Amino acid sequence: PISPIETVPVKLKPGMDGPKVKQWPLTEEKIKALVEICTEMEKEGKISKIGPENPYNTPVFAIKKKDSTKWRKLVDFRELNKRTQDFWEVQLGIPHPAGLKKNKSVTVLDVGDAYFSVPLDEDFRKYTAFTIPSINNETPGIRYQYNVLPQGWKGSPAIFQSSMTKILEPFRKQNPDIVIYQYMDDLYVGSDLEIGQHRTKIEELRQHLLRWGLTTPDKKHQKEPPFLWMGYELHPDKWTVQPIVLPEKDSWTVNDIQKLVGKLNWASQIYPGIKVRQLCKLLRGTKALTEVIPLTEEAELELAENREILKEPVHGVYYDPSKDLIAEIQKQGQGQWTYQIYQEPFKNLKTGKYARMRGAHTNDVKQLTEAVQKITTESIVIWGKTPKFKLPIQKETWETWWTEYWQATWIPEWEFVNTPPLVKLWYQLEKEPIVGAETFYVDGAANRETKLGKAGYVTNRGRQKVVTLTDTTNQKTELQAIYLALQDSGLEVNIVTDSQYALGIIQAQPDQSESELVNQIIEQLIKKEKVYLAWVPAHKGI
Amino acid sequence: IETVPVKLKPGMDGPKVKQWPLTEEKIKALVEICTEMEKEGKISKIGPENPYNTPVFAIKKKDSTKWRKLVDFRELNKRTQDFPHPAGLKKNKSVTVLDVGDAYFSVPLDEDFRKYTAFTIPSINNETPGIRYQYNVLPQGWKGSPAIFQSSMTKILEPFRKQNPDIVIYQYMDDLYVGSDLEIGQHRTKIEELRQHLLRWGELHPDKWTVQPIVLPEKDSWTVNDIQKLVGKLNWASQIYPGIKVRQLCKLLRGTKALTEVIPLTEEAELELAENREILKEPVHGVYYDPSKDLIAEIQKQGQGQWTYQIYQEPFKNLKTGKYARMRGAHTNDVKQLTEAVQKITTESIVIWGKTPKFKLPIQKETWETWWTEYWQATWIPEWEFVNTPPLVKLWYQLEKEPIVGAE
Numbered sequence: 001p002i003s004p005i006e007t008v009p010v011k012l013k014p015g016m017d018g019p020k021v022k023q024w025p026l027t028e029e030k031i032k033a034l035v036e037i038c039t040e041m042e043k044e045g046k047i048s049k050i051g052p053e054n055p056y057n058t059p060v061f062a063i064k065k066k067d068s069t070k071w072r073k074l075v076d077f078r079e080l081n082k083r084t085q086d087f088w089e090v091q092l093g094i095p096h097p098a099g100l101k102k103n104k105s106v107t108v109l110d111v112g113d114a115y116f117s118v119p120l121d122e123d124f125r126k127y128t129a130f131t132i133p134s135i136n137n138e139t140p141g142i143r144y145q146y147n148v149l150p151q152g153w154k155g156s157p158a159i160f161q162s163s164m165t166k167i168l169e170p171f172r173k174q175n176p177d178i179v180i181y182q183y184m185d186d187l188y189v190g191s192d193l194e195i196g197q198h199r200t201k202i203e204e205l206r207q208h209l210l211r212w213g214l215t216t217p218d219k220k221h222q223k224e225p226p227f228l229w230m231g232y233e234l235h236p237d238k239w240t241v242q243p244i245v246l247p248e249k250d251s252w253t254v255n256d257i258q259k260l261v262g263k264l265n266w267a268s269q270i271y272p273g274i275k276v277r278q279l280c281k282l283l284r285g286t287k288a289l290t291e292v293i294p295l296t297e298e299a300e301l302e303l304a305e306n307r308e309i310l311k312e313p314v315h316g317v318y319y320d321p322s323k324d325l326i327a328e329i330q331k332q333g334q335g336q337w338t339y340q341i342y343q344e345p346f347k348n349l350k351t352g353k354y355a356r357m358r359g360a361h362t363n364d365v366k367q368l369t370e371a372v373q374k375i376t377t378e379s380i381v382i383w384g385k386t387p388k389f390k391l392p393i394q395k396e397t398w399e400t401w402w403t404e405y406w407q408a409t410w411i412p413e414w415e416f417v418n419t420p421p422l423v424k425l426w427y428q429l430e431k432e433p434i435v436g437a438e439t440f441y442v443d444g445a446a447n448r449e450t451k452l453g454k455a456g457y458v459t460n461r462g463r464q465k466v467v468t469l470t471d472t473t474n475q476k477t478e479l480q481a482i483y484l485a486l487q488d489s490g491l492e493v494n495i496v497t498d499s500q501y502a503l504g505i506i507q508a509q510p511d512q513s514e515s516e517l518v519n520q521i522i523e524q525l526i527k528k529e530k531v532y533l534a535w536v537p538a539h540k541g542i
Numbered sequence: 543i544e545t546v547p548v549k550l551k552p553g554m555d556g557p558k559v560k561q562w563p564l565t566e567e568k569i570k571a572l573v574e575i576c577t578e579m580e581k582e583g584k585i586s587k588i589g590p591e592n593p594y595n596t597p598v599f600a601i602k603k604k605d606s607t608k609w610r611k612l613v614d615f616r617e618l619n620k621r622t623q624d625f626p627h628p629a630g631l632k633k634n635k636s637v638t639v640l641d642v643g644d645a646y647f648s649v650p651l652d653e654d655f656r657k658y659t660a661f662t663i664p665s666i667n668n669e670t671p672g673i674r675y676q677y678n679v680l681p682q683g684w685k686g687s688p689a690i691f692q693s694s695m696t697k698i699l700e701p702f703r704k705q706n707p708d709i710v711i712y713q714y715m716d717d718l719y720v721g722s723d724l725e726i727g728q729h730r731t732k733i734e735e736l737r738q739h740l741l742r743w744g745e746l747h748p749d750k751w752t753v754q755p756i757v758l759p760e761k762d763s764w765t766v767n768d769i770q771k772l773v774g775k776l777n778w779a780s781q782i783y784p785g786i787k788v789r790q791l792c793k794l795l796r797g798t799k800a801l802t803e804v805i806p807l808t809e810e811a812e813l814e815l816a817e818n819r820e821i822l823k824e825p826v827h828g829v830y831y832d833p834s835k836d837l838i839a840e841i842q843k844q845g846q847g848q849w850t851y852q853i854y855q856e857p858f859k860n861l862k863t864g865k866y867a868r869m870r871g872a873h874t875n876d877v878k879q880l881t882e883a884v885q886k887i888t889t890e891s892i893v894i895w896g897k898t899p900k901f902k903l904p905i906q907k908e909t910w911e912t913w914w915t916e917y918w919q920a921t922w923i924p925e926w927e928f929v930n931t932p933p934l935v936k937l938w939y940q941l942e943k944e945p946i947v948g949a950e
């Protein structure tokens with residue numbers, strides 16, 4: 001059943017030419033078969049014999065399709081695909097489950113080998129040439145070519161897709177209240193019509209395609225809800241999450257653990273609470289991928305406590321456009337955030353978590369911020385809109401922080417939710433010097449090459465110290481200086497430094513960094529009651 | 543009409559830029575707009591055989607409540623082959639901008655170049671495949687467009703030109719800048735006249751843009767800190783004016799004394815300072831625009847709704863500098879202010895050098911990417927990079943002067 005649809009012009013990449021690869025030798029069994037199979041689609045008009053005026057060739061194979069001790073074929077276009085032009089979005093991103101709306105019914109039609117229903121650009125066909133050898137390479141091979149979109153070829157989907165989209169426009173319009181989703185060779189149709197109506201329509205549709213030689217399976221040979229959408233299990237009115245099965249195991253190999261933490265990490269998105277910390281520790285030093293690792297007891301408790309989480313399956317709802325979108329956030333730890341999106345409290349649409357690699361230097365609020373952002377993007381992609389937010393941060397806190405931060409930042413319409421732990425400013429450098437406080441003039445220098453440094457200070461109150469450092473660096477010395485100063489200061493301190501990095505802290509006032517040293521200071525700062533940090537040009541008289 | 547052939551700079555290939563996700567409302571708007579343009583044959587749905595793409599999106603201008611379709615041909619423009627700016631409106635007493643993008647849609651576009659204008663309306667949640675279009679006429683926002691339509695354009699205007707040589711008319715893409723020193727009465731009226739003149743075929747204030755000097759603080763009594771701060775600033779600032787000196791001052795700063803401690807100035811320092819205040823009374827010498835080099839714009843957030851910027855071609859050699867206060871209403875959102883700011887500064891760049899600056903923005907790419915479009919209101923889109931404001935450059939310009947009272 002071929003189709004009467006205009007072919008999409010297809011041409012090879014810039015200045016390249018058709019495939020020219022040799023045909024493997026075949027058994028009496030692998031040749032007999034392909035001769036039969038090909039003679040089939042041959043009569044079907046799918047392929048056509050070609051003479052020696054075609055210098056191209058693709059390697060044909062023969063594998064006996066499992067669950068059928070019968071033979072089937074397949075061609076290797078790897079080369080052709082290399083030489084074929086590109087097309088646009090062969091998959092502009094998959095619609096996510098939280099973005100759908102409930103329907104009374106959702107049928108799914110396997111257009112199937114509709115790929116072979118769509119006619120290939122007459123001109124291009126020549127490149128699809130392939131050969132069926134003969135026993136003793138006596139008589140030449142029987143040559144063919146595709147007159148229709150071939151399985152495995154680059155342009156196939158793209159073309160099939162658009163073709164489809166065309167064939168579907170008219171029906172779509174006649175039936176606006178119906179929803180079709182074209183994906184691969186599967187046609188997802190849903191509606192809010194009463195069943196009988198729905199049924200009739202699918203039939204109406206089914207016949208529509210059919211008018212285009214587009215054969216699809218009847219109501220007695222379709223697939224039925226739930227529908228497994230990579231990850232989720234889908235029912236016209238709701239979706240679910242598996243649950244996931246953790247293989248209870250004997251010995252654990254590195255590779256195994258990895259694959260494990262993977263599945264696990266994937267899950268934390270839905271089941272926050274999941275933890276893979278100690279499990280991750282089992283990789284440290286791992287010499288080979290197949291070496292077995294003694295699962296530490298800490299690892300047992302964790303791996304265990306996870307199976308439990310993955311017991312309770314997960315139910316979710318679909319998107320109701322009639323309702324606002326609410327996104328709530330939680331800080332599970334330093335750098336970790338959880339969020340859930342729902343319309344009706346507890347009726348979750350979507351959820352997830354994020355681990356924030358401290359990186360150079362951040363602060364919780366900033367991170368909070370980045371979360372929102374990410375979230376906001378996700379939302380839009382799915383709902384074409386952004387969620388009103390519920391955040392564990394007070395408005396005062398936020399206002400204090402952003403109006404003064406050096407970088408431009410923003411949080412869409414949001415509302416504080418008093419769900420501890422709230423994000424707060426761990427500290428704040430005074431805007432001006434502290435009257436009646438020690439003043440520490442700090443300095444630290446290190447020989448770049450020998451890595452020998454000295455850190456120290458002296459105060460207006462006469463106090464002084466100094467330290468010799470081995471295997472250090474300058475930035476470190478500098479900081480160190482500041483560190484000591486904080487160390488020996490007392491609840492109120494004024495610290496003056498010519499450090500470039502100190503200029504950084506002043507400006508970003510980070511509450512976390514990759515540098516253990518910095519962190520050391522961060523902690524110290526938090527401890528102080530009031531700190532005033534000042535910077536002065538280096539090597540000047542000061 | 544007979545269409546002029548447009549080609550890409552040799553070696554270049556068409557744009558293949560991914561469409562950013564759009565909010566529902568926009569997508570709708572766009573669809574609407576596009577189905578219409580299609581009827582009118584301006585654009586035509588394309589297939590997949592075409593692999594090129596450019597981002598699109600909608601916006602609304604202040605005083606506009608009708609959704610306008612904007613495209614980002616930046617990439618394309620860069621790849622499109624090449625083919626005059628007066629210094630008058632620079633001085634004009636007033637300038638009015640006009641949107642003449644509508645013209646282009648009259649002129650057809652060379653067929654072989656249409657492919658490259660491919661753009662894609664997205665679908666929420668990827669429910670449906672994208673809706674691929676392509677232009678059949680001159681695209682607004684494209685560089686080739688004001689180019690090709692140059693002729694007709696000039697004609698159309700000559701009568702207004704010739705009967706009013708006391709008026710400057712500058713075109714930069716979809717807009718036309720009309721300047722005159724004629725008081726508002728005659729300006730506005732003459733502009734509307736001009737509109738009619740155009741319709742027939744089918745306020746800015748240039749000088750009140752003076753660079754502000756860097757005024758230094760003055761105290762009755764200075765403290766250790768005050769000085770240290772002042773010194774720090776000066777020392778840095780000496781990369782612009784080498785005339786500045788800071789030794790006398792640094793002298794008083796020798797000795798481990800409390801920041802709050804008060805220090806009286808040595809007559810020597812007092813001069814030193816006085817002397818620097820002088821050097822700072824005027825923009826550094828030797829700074830001349832170089833058409834052959836890129837114009838750069840940095841912006842520093844100053845908090846409180848304030849922002850400072852400097853346009854320059856070589857670091858420290860600022861052609862222009864300025865401060866910007868948030869528009870009434872953006873009382874809570876930086877991006878809004880920041881985008882607004884961007885638009886204003888680009889404008890002047892245009893007015894002045896008839897050229898868009900490359901922006902160095904104090905925001906994280908993601909933040910910017912996610913919301914700029916939301917508050918954009920200009921047919922053009924400048925180039926940008928994301929940065930980390932040095933603490934110092936920020937303190938320095940914070941020091942710029944302001945009117946004693948303002949504008950009343």
Ligand SMILES: Cc1ccnc2c1NC(=O)c1cccnc1N2C1CC1
Nearest residue numbers: 100101106181188189190227234236
């Ligand atoms: C996999 C998939 C992708 C996009 N949409 C859908 C589906 N499948 C469904 O089973 C489904 C379930 C609920 C709502 N829409 C759904 N459908 C819509 C088509 C009826």
